[PDB]
Amino acid sequence: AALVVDNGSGMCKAGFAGDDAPRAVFPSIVGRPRHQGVMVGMGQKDSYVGDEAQSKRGILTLKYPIEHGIVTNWDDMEKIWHHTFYNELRVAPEEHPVLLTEAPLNPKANREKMTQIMFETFNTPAMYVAIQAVLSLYASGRTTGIVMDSGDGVTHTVPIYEGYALPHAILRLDLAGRDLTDYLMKILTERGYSFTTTAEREIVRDIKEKLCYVALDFEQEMATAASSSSLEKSYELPDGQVITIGNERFRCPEALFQPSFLGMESCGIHETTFNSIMKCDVDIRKDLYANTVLSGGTTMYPGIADRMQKEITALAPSTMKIKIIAPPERKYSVWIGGSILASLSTFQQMWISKQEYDESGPSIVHRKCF
Amino acid sequence: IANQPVVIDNGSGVIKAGFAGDQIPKYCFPNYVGRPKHVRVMAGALEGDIFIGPKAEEHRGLLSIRYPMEHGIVKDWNDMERIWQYVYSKDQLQTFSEEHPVLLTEAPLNPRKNRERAAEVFFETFNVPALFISMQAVLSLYATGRTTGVVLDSGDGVTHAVPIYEGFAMPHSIMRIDIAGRDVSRFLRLYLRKEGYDFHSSSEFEIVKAIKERACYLSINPQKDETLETEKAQYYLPDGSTIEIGPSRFRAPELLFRPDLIGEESEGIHEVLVFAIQKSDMDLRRTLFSNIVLSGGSTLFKGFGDRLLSEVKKLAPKDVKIRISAPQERLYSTWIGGSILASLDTFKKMWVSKKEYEEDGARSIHRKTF
Amino acid sequence: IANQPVVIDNGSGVIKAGFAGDQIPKYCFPNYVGRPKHVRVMAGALEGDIFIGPKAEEHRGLLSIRYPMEHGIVKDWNDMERIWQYVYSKDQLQTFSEEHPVLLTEAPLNPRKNRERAAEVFFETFNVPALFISMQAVLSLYATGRTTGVVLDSGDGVTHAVPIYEGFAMPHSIMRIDIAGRDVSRFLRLYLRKEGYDFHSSSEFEIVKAIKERACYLSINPQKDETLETEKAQYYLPDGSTIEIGPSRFRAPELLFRPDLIGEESEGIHEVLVFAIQKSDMDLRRTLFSNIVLSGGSTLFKGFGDRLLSEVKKLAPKDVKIRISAPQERLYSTWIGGSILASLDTFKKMWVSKKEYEEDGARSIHRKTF
Amino acid sequence: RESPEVLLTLDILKHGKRFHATVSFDTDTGLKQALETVNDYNPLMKDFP
Amino acid sequence: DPKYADLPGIARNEPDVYETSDLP
Numbered sequence A: 001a002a003l004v005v006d007n008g009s010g011m012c013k014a015g016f017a018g019d020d021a022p023r024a025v026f027p028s029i030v031g032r033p034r035h036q037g038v039m040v041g042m043g044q045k046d047s048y049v050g051d052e053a054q055s056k057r058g059i060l061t062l063k064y065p066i067e068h069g070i071v072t073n074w075d076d077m078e079k080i081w082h083h084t085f086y087n088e089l090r091v092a093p094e095e096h097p098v099l100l101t102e103a104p105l106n107p108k109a110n111r112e113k114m115t116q117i118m119f120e121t122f123n124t125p126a127m128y129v130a131i132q133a134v135l136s137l138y139a140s141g142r143t144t145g146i147v148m149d150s151g152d153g154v155t156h157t158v159p160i161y162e163g164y165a166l167p168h169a170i171l172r173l174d175l176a177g178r179d180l181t182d183y184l185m186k187i188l189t190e191r192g193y194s195f196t197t198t199a200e201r202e203i204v205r206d207i208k209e210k211l212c213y214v215a216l217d218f219e220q221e222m223a224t225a226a227s228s229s230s231l232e233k234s235y236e237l238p239d240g241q242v243i244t245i246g247n248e249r250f251r252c253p254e255a256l257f258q259p260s261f262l263g264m265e266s267c268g269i270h271e272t273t274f275n276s277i278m279k280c281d282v283d284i285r286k287d288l289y290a291n292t293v294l295s296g297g298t299t300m301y302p303g304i305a306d307r308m309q310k311e312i313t314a315l316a317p318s319t320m321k322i323k324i325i326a327p328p329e330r331k332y333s334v335w336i337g338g339s340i341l342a343s344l345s346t347f348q349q350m351w352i353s354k355q356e357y358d359e360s361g362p363s364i365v366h367r368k369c370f
Numbered sequence B, C: 001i002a003n004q005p006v007v008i009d010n011g012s013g014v015i016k017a018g019f020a021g022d023q024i025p026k027y028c029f030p031n032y033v034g035r036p037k038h039v040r041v042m043a044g045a046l047e048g049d050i051f052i053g054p055k056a057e058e059h060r061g062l063l064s065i066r067y068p069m070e071h072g073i074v075k076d077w078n079d080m081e082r083i084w085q086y087v088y089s090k091d092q093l094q095t096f097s098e099e100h101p102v103l104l105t106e107a108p109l110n111p112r113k114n115r116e117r118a119a120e121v122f123f124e125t126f127n128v129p130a131l132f133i134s135m136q137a138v139l140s141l142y143a144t145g146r147t148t149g150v151v152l153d154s155g156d157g158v159t160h161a162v163p164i165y166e167g168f169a170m171p172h173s174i175m176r177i178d179i180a181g182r183d184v185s186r187f188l189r190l191y192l193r194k195e196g197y198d199f200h201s202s203s204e205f206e207i208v209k210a211i212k213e214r215a216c217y218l219s220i221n222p223q224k225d226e227t228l229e230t231e232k233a234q235y236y237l238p239d240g241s242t243i244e245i246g247p248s249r250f251r252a253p254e255l256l257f258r259p260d261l262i263g264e265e266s267e268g269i270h271e272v273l274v275f276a277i278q279k280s281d282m283d284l285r286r287t288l289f290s291n292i293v294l295s296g297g298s299t300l301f302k303g304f305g306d307r308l309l310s311e312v313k314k315l316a317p318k319d320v321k322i323r324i325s326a327p328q329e330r331l332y333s334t335w336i337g338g339s340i341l342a343s344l345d346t347f348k349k350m351w352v353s354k355k356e357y358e359e360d361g362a363r364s365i366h367r368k369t370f
Numbered sequence D: 001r002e003s004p005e006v007l008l009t010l011d012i013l014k015h016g017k018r019f020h021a022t023v024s025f026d027t028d029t030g031l032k033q034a035l036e037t038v039n040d041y042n043p044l045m046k047d048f049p
Numbered sequence E: 001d002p003k004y005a006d007l008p009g010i011a012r013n014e015p016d017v018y019e020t021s022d023l024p
């Protein structure tokens, strides 16, 4: 009936309406191998993608096809697309309307180009693209709630009230764990470890997710670490090397609270979210403390909820009862919300068909996508 | 009869309703305008856009609350009909316009066009079989049991006095200055900005109204109490912010007695009533000194009655008897007086027949109300 | 006397100072604080960290902008202390505060606490012999010579209209709303956000400011010119960049008349101006159209007044006579009128004797000032 | 059916991450269709002389 | 009475009629 395809600069998923588990799950990164000059036989694919590239990661360099929403090449993106379709479902696009997502700050020409090629290349019957946060609170069970996206390269605070919201109220900083990966990789380089290719990035993001827990005050934690190095846990890589880090682990996500680690002339996630709350009604802000909804794939780290809670606790008065909604499945929940969205017939009455672009052109993209 | 008359207690800002003989209006609510202001994507919100109730008193950050009753004189009669349809709602009245007699409350000396347009409404859109509008002063005397008196009242931006013995025709002996608390609340908001507190929204203004009517009094000795030091005790916002007492809650309501401070030459209730006494006759003025029929819901503040009596002492000569009608339910007393008024024998002839509207209406309406 | 009165022209965006008789602009400068940004140990560098001037407007990526002034209201008074010390510089002042009289500008309706704190510095930390602060509108009117006047102007953050005639202040007739150029920059950035151009830094902010007072003009037709097809010729930037014209440049000041698009509700500059005219009297209203005011340096636009006059046509009745200038320096005008004002005979009574400030202070000035 | 507490409990049931109650809440409740059916019969059947 | 209960309230510790000083 539909064609549900969750997206992401990393995590790109797919399936259909009513499906609970995304059929397609893979890193949406573009792998480019070491094409050298000497001869060779029996060939290979021009450029393997994600899982295809991860399979032979030793040559394949999974560079980023998108950059906080800045898609580098549409062609490569389509190669990802086409192969993913004819990799996972192997179904033609003329079957059902497609379902895709996006986020703001994007120049309208990108989403226009996107949908334009989506009709060009695929000739789908209808189609649709939305905002991840909508599916987030949509799958949560509220029409009034503030959430924040922390993907691989995105961050955005969305406050909603009975479905209503304001773009002025919705704030955004497209910065995420990829930056942390850079920071972590270079500080471990300072510790004495080599990091050149993209595989370095893969291993460090791996162990990064494996160790970015959240403590409270790095001063006393640092004091205890220097006092007792028992927290400095060891880990042996696929290669014989075994690193020992304790501070590094949890202090790497502290940059989310402090741009000082990178010197970004910015604000902390908590106070940024606080200002998002500040752009509201005195009554609904209380509901934001009640509807303290959390999302983002880079929020699968234990401790930060209590941190952010304590932050705003120090910010907001005592009467502001904090009620953090912390789903540990928010990553996949957007795709799931897309399926649920694909289940409500009225929404499936609302569409973006062929003739709309064929005649109307891309202005209906501005007034119809959302 | 099951076709019991309908008592509708209007007011510049408040309105009540019920049947004949009832002692409490089961429906009491304000007078305003409202419509949403944002955009939802996910459904599940409320629709109708002009709400009256907890949802209206809850989703204040969405609607645009206005007031068509300019000093009671309404201009969005259509929206009032919408409100009257809400008055006939499934939880409100469930009756039809052609099923019951209707008694209506009013403010005097208004243009004929008002009653004209109202007759058009309740005889064309609504189709009332028996409709009648009168003066609450008579209803007030009914609710108090007295017969002769000087009935003074205050709405929200409306004040008027009716010194008349038993309903005798004395139009030249009537005073009216329509100004009260709404602008005082705006004036309070002015004081707020004066000490750094800017407010502009409709809902925001209503919260200020709650502040005013919640926290206001009258320091009997203006200059003297000004020389002394205040308290500036702080009430707290829904978030919980500073709400000091300031010079405000007592100095601002005195403007009702020194109206020139707003930049308008007027007289002040005291002088107004004194002029009304001068509008009376020396062979009756002694009774009129005893006749002190006070009313008005806005009047319910501290330092009001007794200080106003001191004002009278400064104004009225020797040998004057204080006999003030002053329960706080004088608003409801109008509704109650109209309820008992509806429960009468001669009341049939007192109203206006629907067929009379079918014949001429207008002039006959002015003839029956006089 | 050698103790020439020190005129101080403090506004929101534009900020200056001066002296009596010395007509010509002394020293121009912006309204913020310049903090350092990076570290090193190497020699050959300037230190002090409080940098204002050529080095501030030269080393933008080395110094952050601090605006404690919020719509003419500063929160961190110490920043003003540093600013005033920069004024006290003998490259800027060459004199002492305690040896010369001082006059200063101020937008009205600001909280008294600001004035209190200011005078605390202005007398306690600097025993200034004479000081008086007033409204820039008054100074401008003194610069004109019309006894009349409805000062309509905007700095970089406050819209304001002052109706007056022969100095007669009708505070109920005078109005203001804190909005101007700061949001113009913000909205400019908003269009940049719409087209992917993040310019958030303090340096980036001044770049946007250059765009503001560089890439701007207008159009008398909002949607008639908005729904068309643009050309968007690129323009060379101070980096080496070149970006399009954008219709948005003239679309941005329409937000001043349609703030609902930015979200907050207001009325319209000219509309509130008309409301002030409505608060005046019939006879004076004719003079109000005769007495128009060229004020606010933000107003520098092509066909600006044309569009506003068209709005007047849409609002005022016939027989409206309004005319135009050949303006010289709308900015400096106020400061110049204040300089002439400072050069007056009876003007000596206008200050505040510091000894009285020692005795009573603020409250006495508040009652002595308007 | 207008019972707010009943509909309230239904809302809690839906909020328990099973929002499928609207299906039976709208399909079986074709009460409005029967209401308009009798409203179609309102000038002829109802108020019949 | 419930009349004063179901409504926002009537006179609090103060009557309606007052009186001038003795021998006015």
Ligand SMILES: Nc1ncnc2c1ncn2[C@@H]1O[C@H](COP(=O)(O)OP(=O)(O)OP(=O)(O)O)[C@@H](O)[C@H]1O
Residues within 6 Å of the ligand: A007, A008, A009, A010, A011, A012, A132, A150, A151, A152, A153, A154, A176, A177, A178, A205, A209, A296, A297, A298, A299, A300, A301, A331
């Ligand atoms: N299980 C996990 N534990 C910890 N962190 C995770 C986990 N899964 C993903 N992340 C973080 O999320 C980012 C990977 O991308 P994510 O899973 O958020 O999907 P995505 O591609 O970001 O979706 P979008 O690009 O639409 O936001 C990385 O920064 C990584 O640190």
Ligand SMILES: Nc1ncnc2c1ncn2[C@@H]1O[C@H](COP(=O)(O)OP(=O)(O)O)[C@@H](O)[C@H]1O
Residues within 6 Å of the ligand: B010, B011, B012, B013, B014, B015, B154, B155, B156, B157, B158, B181, B213, B214, B296, B297, B298, B299, B300, B301, B331
């Ligand atoms: N605590 C209070 N004290 C005095 N007045 C109040 C208080 N609360 C509300 N009011 C005002 O009393 C007024 C009631 O008088 P009424 O004649 O009903 O006004 P209206 O004519 O506007 O309906 C209301 O307008 C309301 O603003």
Ligand SMILES: Nc1ncnc2c1ncn2[C@@H]1O[C@H](COP(=O)(O)OP(=O)(O)O)[C@@H](O)[C@H]1O
Residues within 6 Å of the ligand: C010, C011, C012, C013, C014, C015, C153, C154, C155, C156, C157, C181, C212, C213, C216, C295, C296, C297, C298, C299, C300, C301, C331
């Ligand atoms: N050409 C221009 N376009 C837009 N804004 C301008 C232009 N020239 C000056 N401005 C702005 O106008 C403001 C001048 O207003 P002014 O009446 O001097 O008040 P203030 O002294 O508070 O700035 C300054 O803030 C300046 O940034």
